[PDB]
Amino acid sequence: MQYKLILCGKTLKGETTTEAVDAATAECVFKQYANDNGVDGEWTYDDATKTFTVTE
Amino acid sequence: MQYKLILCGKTLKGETTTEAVDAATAECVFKQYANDNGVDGEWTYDDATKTFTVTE
Ligand SMILES: *SCC1=CC(C)(C)N(O)C1(C)C
Ligand SMILES: *SCC1=CC(C)(C)N(O)C1(C)C
Ligand SMILES: *SCC1=CC(C)(C)N(O)C1(C)C
C-alpha cells in the first residue's frame, strides 16, 4: 500500500483586540470578524490571558 | 474587558510517500523520516486518503 505524509506548519496571519463585557460576547464579535471573511476554522480560548486563537 | 484574537494559518512544508504493508508500519517509517529531519509535531492520520500529517 502507498501512504502519504504531509508536513505542515503554522503561520501568524494577524492579531486584533476588542472590548466586550464578557468572553462569550467577544467570541461572537471575533467569529463575525473571522467568518464574514468566509473562513470557518478551529477555535481556542484561554481565559487566563483573555485570548482567542483561530486557525483557518 | 479587553480580549485578544490571534489569527493563524497553515503552511505546507513538504510531502513524501512510502510503500508499506499497513498503516502502523507506514507510521513508524514516517516518524523515522520526521525524526531524521528534526521535524517535531502533532500527528493525524486519515485512513480514507492513507495520509498522515505532522504539524510543527
Ligand atoms: S497542512 C495541514 C492540513 C492537512 C490536511 C489534513 C490535508 N488538511 O486538511 C489541513 C489543511 C488541515
Ligand atoms: S498563529 C500560529 C501560532 C499559534 C500559537 C500556538 C498560538 N503560536 O505560538 C503561533 C504564533 C506559532
Ligand atoms: S512506530 C510508530 C509509532 C510511534 C509511537 C508514537 C511511539 N507509536 O505508538 C507507534 C507504534 C504507533
mmCIF file of C-alpha atoms and ligand atoms in Angstrom:
data_model
loop_
_atom_site.group_PDB
_atom_site.id
_atom_site.type_symbol
_atom_site.label_atom_id
_atom_site.label_comp_id
_atom_site.label_asym_id
_atom_site.label_seq_id
_atom_site.Cartn_x
_atom_site.Cartn_y
_atom_site.Cartn_z
ATOM 1 C CA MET A 1 0.000 0.000 0.000
ATOM 2 C CA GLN A 2 1.123 3.574 -0.675
ATOM 3 C CA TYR A 3 0.972 6.012 2.253
ATOM 4 C CA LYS A 4 1.482 9.744 2.249
ATOM 5 C CA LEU A 5 2.972 12.118 4.768
ATOM 6 C CA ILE A 6 2.249 15.838 4.679
ATOM 7 C CA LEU A 7 4.443 18.107 6.684
ATOM 8 C CA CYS A 8 2.677 21.283 7.828
ATOM 9 C CA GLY A 9 3.483 24.380 9.846
ATOM 10 C CA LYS A 10 1.577 27.190 11.466
ATOM 11 C CA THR A 11 1.772 30.792 10.426
ATOM 12 C CA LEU A 12 0.655 34.102 12.059
ATOM 13 C CA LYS A 13 -1.895 35.963 9.915
ATOM 14 C CA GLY A 14 -2.913 38.654 12.245
ATOM 15 C CA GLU A 15 -3.752 39.946 15.658
ATOM 16 C CA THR A 16 -6.507 42.167 16.993
ATOM 17 C CA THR A 17 -8.184 43.076 20.304
ATOM 18 C CA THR A 18 -11.730 44.135 21.170
ATOM 19 C CA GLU A 19 -13.689 45.478 24.151
ATOM 20 C CA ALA A 20 -16.525 43.245 25.284
ATOM 21 C CA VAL A 21 -18.478 42.708 28.538
ATOM 22 C CA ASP A 22 -17.530 39.072 28.660
ATOM 23 C CA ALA A 23 -15.725 36.224 26.792
ATOM 24 C CA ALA A 24 -18.887 34.953 25.161
ATOM 25 C CA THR A 25 -19.622 38.316 23.630
ATOM 26 C CA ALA A 26 -16.014 38.752 22.494
ATOM 27 C CA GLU A 27 -16.209 35.308 20.820
ATOM 28 C CA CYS A 28 -19.263 36.279 18.786
ATOM 29 C CA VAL A 29 -17.568 39.514 17.695
ATOM 30 C CA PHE A 30 -14.388 37.652 16.702
ATOM 31 C CA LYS A 31 -16.308 34.850 14.891
ATOM 32 C CA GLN A 32 -18.053 37.516 12.851
ATOM 33 C CA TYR A 33 -14.708 39.225 12.037
ATOM 34 C CA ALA A 34 -13.100 35.894 11.082
ATOM 35 C CA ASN A 35 -16.202 34.403 9.246
ATOM 36 C CA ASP A 36 -17.976 37.104 7.257
ATOM 37 C CA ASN A 37 -14.444 36.853 5.959
ATOM 38 C CA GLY A 38 -15.644 33.376 4.943
ATOM 39 C CA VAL A 39 -13.114 31.123 6.728
ATOM 40 C CA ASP A 40 -14.598 28.649 9.254
ATOM 41 C CA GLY A 41 -11.688 27.380 11.422
ATOM 42 C CA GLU A 42 -10.533 25.891 14.684
ATOM 43 C CA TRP A 43 -11.032 27.991 17.824
ATOM 44 C CA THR A 44 -9.248 28.092 21.118
ATOM 45 C CA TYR A 45 -9.932 30.382 24.121
ATOM 46 C CA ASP A 46 -7.657 30.807 27.099
ATOM 47 C CA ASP A 47 -9.403 32.699 29.881
ATOM 48 C CA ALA A 48 -6.131 33.414 31.870
ATOM 49 C CA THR A 49 -4.865 35.568 29.012
ATOM 50 C CA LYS A 50 -8.298 36.560 27.543
ATOM 51 C CA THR A 51 -7.026 35.313 24.218
ATOM 52 C CA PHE A 52 -8.758 33.525 21.366
ATOM 53 C CA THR A 53 -6.966 31.889 18.504
ATOM 54 C CA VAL A 54 -8.497 30.874 15.219
ATOM 55 C CA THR A 55 -6.676 28.624 12.775
ATOM 56 C CA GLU A 56 -8.268 28.903 9.385
ATOM 57 C CA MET B 1 -12.782 43.938 29.299
ATOM 58 C CA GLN B 2 -10.133 43.593 26.573
ATOM 59 C CA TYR B 3 -9.943 40.378 24.593
ATOM 60 C CA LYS B 4 -7.347 39.340 22.058
ATOM 61 C CA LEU B 5 -7.661 37.316 18.877
ATOM 62 C CA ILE B 6 -4.670 35.692 17.182
ATOM 63 C CA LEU B 7 -5.450 34.601 13.608
ATOM 64 C CA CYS B 8 -3.385 31.626 12.392
ATOM 65 C CA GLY B 9 -2.856 29.942 9.043
ATOM 66 C CA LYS B 10 -1.500 26.605 7.906
ATOM 67 C CA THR B 11 1.599 26.139 5.766
ATOM 68 C CA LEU B 12 2.584 23.188 3.581
ATOM 69 C CA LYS B 13 6.269 22.499 4.227
ATOM 70 C CA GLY B 14 6.664 19.121 2.428
ATOM 71 C CA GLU B 15 5.148 15.865 1.389
ATOM 72 C CA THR B 16 6.594 12.363 0.904
ATOM 73 C CA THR B 17 5.251 8.893 0.300
ATOM 74 C CA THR B 18 6.223 5.419 1.335
ATOM 75 C CA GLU B 19 5.254 1.875 0.460
ATOM 76 C CA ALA B 20 4.143 -0.339 3.386
ATOM 77 C CA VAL B 21 2.073 -3.395 4.342
ATOM 78 C CA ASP B 22 -0.149 -1.438 6.674
ATOM 79 C CA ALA B 23 -0.741 1.917 8.284
ATOM 80 C CA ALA B 24 1.059 1.030 11.514
ATOM 81 C CA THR B 25 4.297 0.248 9.556
ATOM 82 C CA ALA B 26 3.890 3.421 7.499
ATOM 83 C CA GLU B 27 3.621 5.436 10.644
ATOM 84 C CA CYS B 28 6.870 4.073 12.057
ATOM 85 C CA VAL B 29 8.587 4.788 8.728
ATOM 86 C CA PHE B 30 7.266 8.350 8.618
ATOM 87 C CA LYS B 31 8.166 9.024 12.201
ATOM 88 C CA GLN B 32 11.743 7.973 11.338
ATOM 89 C CA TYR B 33 11.774 10.313 8.370
ATOM 90 C CA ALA B 34 10.413 13.145 10.535
ATOM 91 C CA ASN B 35 12.958 12.476 13.301
ATOM 92 C CA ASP B 36 15.811 12.357 10.815
ATOM 93 C CA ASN B 37 14.719 15.792 9.529
ATOM 94 C CA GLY B 38 14.301 17.339 13.017
ATOM 95 C CA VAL B 39 10.505 17.660 12.343
ATOM 96 C CA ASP B 40 8.658 17.520 15.653
ATOM 97 C CA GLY B 41 4.899 17.965 15.878
ATOM 98 C CA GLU B 42 1.367 16.726 16.199
ATOM 99 C CA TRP B 43 0.283 13.756 14.133
ATOM 100 C CA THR B 44 -3.007 12.988 12.377
ATOM 101 C CA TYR B 45 -3.977 10.092 10.142
ATOM 102 C CA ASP B 46 -6.808 9.912 7.578
ATOM 103 C CA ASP B 47 -7.499 6.389 6.577
ATOM 104 C CA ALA B 48 -9.680 7.331 3.590
ATOM 105 C CA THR B 49 -6.751 9.002 1.845
ATOM 106 C CA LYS B 50 -3.967 6.900 3.565
ATOM 107 C CA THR B 51 -2.374 10.203 4.573
ATOM 108 C CA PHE B 52 -0.562 11.236 7.730
ATOM 109 C CA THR B 53 0.108 14.825 8.550
ATOM 110 C CA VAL B 54 2.612 16.146 11.025
ATOM 111 C CA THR B 55 2.116 19.722 12.102
ATOM 112 C CA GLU B 56 5.023 21.611 13.620
HETATM 113 S S1 LIG C 1 -1.166 21.271 6.105
HETATM 114 C C1 LIG C 1 -2.491 20.969 7.254
HETATM 115 C C2 LIG C 1 -3.633 20.149 6.680
HETATM 116 C C3 LIG C 1 -3.514 18.897 6.213
HETATM 117 C C4 LIG C 1 -4.833 18.341 5.714
HETATM 118 C C5 LIG C 1 -5.277 17.175 6.604
HETATM 119 C C6 LIG C 1 -4.723 17.890 4.255
HETATM 120 N N1 LIG C 1 -5.723 19.477 5.954
HETATM 121 O O1 LIG C 1 -6.920 19.447 5.694
HETATM 122 C C7 LIG C 1 -5.063 20.619 6.586
HETATM 123 C C8 LIG C 1 -5.157 21.892 5.738
HETATM 124 C C9 LIG C 1 -5.610 20.851 7.993
HETATM 125 S S1 LIG C 2 -0.858 31.855 14.903
HETATM 126 C C1 LIG C 2 0.180 30.417 14.931
HETATM 127 C C2 LIG C 2 0.591 30.219 16.346
HETATM 128 C C3 LIG C 2 -0.266 29.687 17.216
HETATM 129 C C4 LIG C 2 0.323 29.609 18.589
HETATM 130 C C5 LIG C 2 0.354 28.164 19.092
HETATM 131 C C6 LIG C 2 -0.601 30.482 19.446
HETATM 132 N N1 LIG C 2 1.656 30.175 18.343
HETATM 133 O O1 LIG C 2 2.507 30.293 19.217
HETATM 134 C C7 LIG C 2 1.913 30.591 16.966
HETATM 135 C C8 LIG C 2 2.157 32.098 16.904
HETATM 136 C C9 LIG C 2 3.060 29.832 16.296
HETATM 137 S S1 LIG C 3 6.451 3.139 15.238
HETATM 138 C C1 LIG C 3 5.137 4.310 15.086
HETATM 139 C C2 LIG C 3 4.665 4.599 16.481
HETATM 140 C C3 LIG C 3 5.231 5.598 17.172
HETATM 141 C C4 LIG C 3 4.621 5.740 18.509
HETATM 142 C C5 LIG C 3 4.082 7.181 18.588
HETATM 143 C C6 LIG C 3 5.721 5.503 19.532
HETATM 144 N N1 LIG C 3 3.626 4.636 18.492
HETATM 145 O O1 LIG C 3 2.911 4.342 19.434
HETATM 146 C C7 LIG C 3 3.580 3.856 17.252
HETATM 147 C C8 LIG C 3 3.930 2.381 17.443
HETATM 148 C C9 LIG C 3 2.202 3.877 16.607
#
